[PDB]
Amino acid sequence: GIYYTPKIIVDYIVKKTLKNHDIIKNPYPRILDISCGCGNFLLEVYDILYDLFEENIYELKKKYDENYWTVDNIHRHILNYCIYGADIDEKAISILKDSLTNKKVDESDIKINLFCCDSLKKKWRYKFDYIVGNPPYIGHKKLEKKYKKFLLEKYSEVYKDKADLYFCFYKKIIDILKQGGIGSVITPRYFLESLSGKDLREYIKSNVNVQEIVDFLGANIFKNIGVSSCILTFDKKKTKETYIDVFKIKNEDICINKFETLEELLKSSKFEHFNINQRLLSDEWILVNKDDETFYNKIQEKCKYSLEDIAISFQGIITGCDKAFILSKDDVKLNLVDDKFLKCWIKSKNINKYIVDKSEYRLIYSNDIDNENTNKRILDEIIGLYKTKLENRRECKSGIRKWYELQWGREKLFFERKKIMYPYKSNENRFAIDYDNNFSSADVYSFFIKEEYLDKFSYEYLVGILNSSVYDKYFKITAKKMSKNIYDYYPNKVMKIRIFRDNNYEEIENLSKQIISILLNKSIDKGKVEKLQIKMDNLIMDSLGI
DNA sequence: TTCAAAAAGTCCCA
DNA sequence: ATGGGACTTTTTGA
Ligand SMILES: CC(C)(C)OC(=O)N1CCC(CCCNc2ncnc3c2ncn3[C@@H]2O[C@H](CO)[C@@H](O)[C@H]2O)CC1
Ligand SMILES: [K+]
Ligand SMILES: [K+]
């Protein structure tokens, strides 16, 4: 559970907080890392501080105690008054203690301010000038349940529902940061857009001044780690300034060590830079350049409806054990199952633009099985092969579900109707019309149009605009970026997409029906579909005035 | 009773 | 062996 931050990022974060520190004015800066590990950040802090003191050793000697300020005394002064570290791992602190001690060449047994503790429970006796480092990330599934109760009770300002452990480290860092202090950390990027991060975003915006945000998007910063990273730099300085430097990466395929320093990367064409007024941040942080802000605001103002206004959204089936209930449509065991129980089953990859692939899997809607005596063959030979795992599901342990029932079987009538489906994680907008009463797991989301909006919006019109290049860019402006070429397509953002209705409605709908007709042909003239899409994008851009 | 969010994703291969 | 690409379960708080 120890993750190594790349050196180029560590050096950037330390320089970000210390490069303009006035060591003459304050020769006693407290620099802290509350998840210091073996000292990836703190050992670099020592080097930066040592050069800082040695460069002004004669100025300090003249201004202050001239016997105290010598070069030979810098090592002791840094460890006594400047470097602070905390980490839950006892071995890590022991290694870091040796590394700090070995920075020089017993004399007086210098004390080092290293604490082996839970940084979220430690009674911190004072505040700190500078805080740097890389907190632990633990999501809602992997976090220990007894610990979560403590977080939900004591960190409720930032931690509710499906929040993450690193939310609480943001709160702790902000709380123990001195007035006028500077904090700089690398964390997952997801809180910038996620629904769970709403409270954390409010806490940051209303308690610190966010100096800078470096968004690496889907770039792989930690080798062999499936996480997407950002660097946040904030202060508690009294300033009329309210603008954030945002550095957004332009190419996710880059390797982080192109230059000797990170700031060479940021100033280069590999990144784009723009400013955001912190006072203009709503509960959402829309961090885009001026052209995209103009683009986004044009669509928002022009569109009088949202998907949430006109549609009913729902998540797919959650069986709780797919292997027990999902079978290949050619499996001989389906001869045991009455066709009244079988539903068509698709995965996220089966969703294309405008249409769904033919299903290859079947779902046993086991909720319709009355008792274990009438359909013993289905239970004994198919579902019962996983009875132990099925019995461990939460609702089976409480008795709410029978061991053979689907955990969250939803309502069949919601799936057995004309509806629009889209994958939950995709590189692009892929909204399809489902004609085949397809069921799916939670990797596919569905919606249908409310009865009172059927005379204003058709499914054919909706998939037309939703799959357009305009709406692909439009959705991605606020979408949750997960990994390289993957965005979350979840209702908490998809249903906030705004839609319009104007004079181009009939032609847009007609072009969509032509596309659907071609896509359903045996000899798909796939080429003409692209041309029809280009014409539709022109109509949509004409409609939205972009 | 029953919804929907959550990548220190997961897994495979050249 | 690693790095990159294809693809995505069920646990969980509310
Ligand atoms: C099952 C599993 C997920 C493994 O566990 C848990 O469900 N618990 C773990 C314990 C607590 C969390 C304690 C938080 N308080 C911590 N206080 C100080 N340092 C910490 C803390 N957590 C992690 N570090 C350090 O951060 C670095 C990560 O780079 C490492 O050097 C790591 O040692 C929550 C419950
Ligand atoms: K003096
Ligand atoms: K990534």
Three-state SS sequence of A422-440: EECEECCCCCEEECCCCEE
Q: Per 3-state DSSP, what percentage of chain A is helix, strand, and coil (rounded to 5)? A: 40, 20, 40
Q: Which residues of A spanning 292-321 put their CB closer than 7 angstroms to strand C? A: 318-321
- What element of type H or E holds A16? helix A7-18
Q: How many helices (H) and strands (E) does chain A have?
A: 21, 22
Q: How many Å does it take to go from CA A279 to C1' B9? A: 34
**CA of residue A195 to C1' of nucleotide C13, angstroms:** 14
CA of A191 to the centre of ligand 1 (A): 19
CA atoms within 13 A on the CB side of A258: 16
Count other Cβ atoms within 10 Å, centred on residue A324.
21
First to last CA, chain A: 49
Elucidation technique: X-ray
Tell me, in angstroms, the distance from the centre of ligand 1 to residue A256's CA.
Answer: 27
Resolution at which this structure was determined, Å? 2.5
CA-based angle A278:A283:A286, to the nearest 5? 60
Enumerate the nucleotides of strand C whose atoms come under 7 Å of any protein CB. 2-14
> Structure tokens of A7?
């050196």
Contacts of A515 (CB under 8 A, 6+ apart): A354, A464, A529, A532, A533
Q: What is the DSSP string of A210-261?
A: EEEEEE-TT---STT----EEEEEEE----S--EEEEEEES-TT--TTSSSS
What residues are in contact with ligand 1 under a 6 Å CB criterion?
Answer: A 1-3, 35, 37, 86-89, 92, 118-120, 134, 136, 138, 142-144, 147
Answer for A424: CB within 7 Å of strand C: yes
Among chain A residues 155 through 184, which have CB within 7 angstroms of nucleic chain B? 162, 164
Domains annotated on chain A, with CATH: 1-134 (3.40.50), 309-541 (no CATH)
β-strand pairing of A444-449 with A419-423: antiparallel
Q: How far apart are CA A65 and CA A30, in angstroms?
A: 20
Q: Distance from the CA of A219 to the center of ligand 3, in angstroms?
A: 5
| Inter-residue contact A418 to A324 (CB < 8 Å) | no
What is the CA(A155)–ligand 1 centre distance, in A? 16
Where do we find the tokens 């006892």? A90
Strand partners, A311: A449
Taking C1' of C13 and every protein CA, the nearest residue is A161
8 Å CB contact between A295 and A546: yes
Name the phi and psi angles at A397, rounded to 5.
Answer: -65, -30
Label each residue of A249-301 as H, E or C: ECCCCCCCCCCCCHHHHHHCCCEEEEEEEHHHCCCCCCCCCHHHHHHHHHHHH
Q: Using CA atoms, how far apart are residues A248 and A287, in angstroms rounded to an integer?
A: 9
State the closest ligand 1 atom to the C-alpha of A121, by its place in the atom list counted from 1.
15
Of all atoms in ligand 1, which is nearest to the CA of residue A120? 15
Is the CB of A393 within 7 Å of strand B? no
| A356: DSSP letter | B
Instruction: Take atom 15 of ligand 1 and give the residue whose Cα is closest.
Output: A118
Contact A529, A515 (CB under 8 A): yes
- Give the strands of the sheet with A432-434, arranged side by side: A311-315, A444-449, A419-423, A432-434
| Greatest CA separation for chain A | 95
Half-sphere exposure of A165 (CA within 13 A, CB side): 18
How far apart (Å, rounded) are the C-alpha atoms in residues A515 and A518? 5
CA A471, A476, A477, A479 dihedral sign is positive
CA of A3 to the centre of ligand 3 (A): 15
**Who contacts A191 (Cβ-Cβ below 8 Å, separation ≥6)?**
A164, A166, A167, A170, A197, A200, A201
CB-based contact A256:A8 (threshold 8 Å) = yes
CA dihedral (A284, A288, A292, A298) in degrees, to 10, reads 20
Ligand having the closest approach to the CA of A64: 2
Instruction: Report if CB A410 to strand B is under 7 Å.
Output: yes
A498 bridge partner residues? A306
How far is Cα A74 from Cα A72, in angstroms, rounded to an integer? 6
* Residue showing tokens 């203009």: A280
Residues near A455 by Cβ (< 8 Å), separated by ≥ 6?
none
CA distances from A113 to A42, A96, A120, A148 (A): 11, 11, 17, 29
Cβ proximity of A160 and A152 under 8 Å: yes
